[PDB]
């Protein structure tokens, strides 16, 4: 069904920044549309006052995955939301394993 409640939609950079800063919880992430690359999502986690943005796009093979630095190995998935459950692995996902979702609906 692809249920993405963490996708508030399209918001400016200033919006995503204050959005994660409001929660005041390290590890808080959100799903916002890329204001530079259409059809591509962006998962941001607030850490050290700096909002770390990560581009998430589906490969031509149909597998879901995120961008990887030149020299790092990235695993492939079969769902957009599945990326969250797989990224919840400490020292095996991102700067911080997603923990507190910041959706625009209910607190």
């Amino acid at each position: 069904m692809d249920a993405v409640a963490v996708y508030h939609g399209k918001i400016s950079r200033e919006t995503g920044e204050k959005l994660l800063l409001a929660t005041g919880l390290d590890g808080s992430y959100l799903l916002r549309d890329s204001e530079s690359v259409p059809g591509v999502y962006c998962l941001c986690v607030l850490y050290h006052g700096y909002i770390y943005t990560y581009r998430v796009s589906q490969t031509e093979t149909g597998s879901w995955s995120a961008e990887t630095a030149p020299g790092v190995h990235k695993r492939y998935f079969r769902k957009i939301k599945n990326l969250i459950s797989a990224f919840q692995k400490p020292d095996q996902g991102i700067v911080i394993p997603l923990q507190y979702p910041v959706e625009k609906k209910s607190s």
């Binding site: 920044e17 006052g49 700096y50 943005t53 995120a66 630095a69």
Partner: peptide
């Protein structure tokens, strides 16, 4: 300062 975004990539 005046910039709360890194736009980095996954280092893991």
């Amino acid at each position: 300062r005046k910039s709360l975004t890194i736009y980095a990539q996954v280092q893991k």
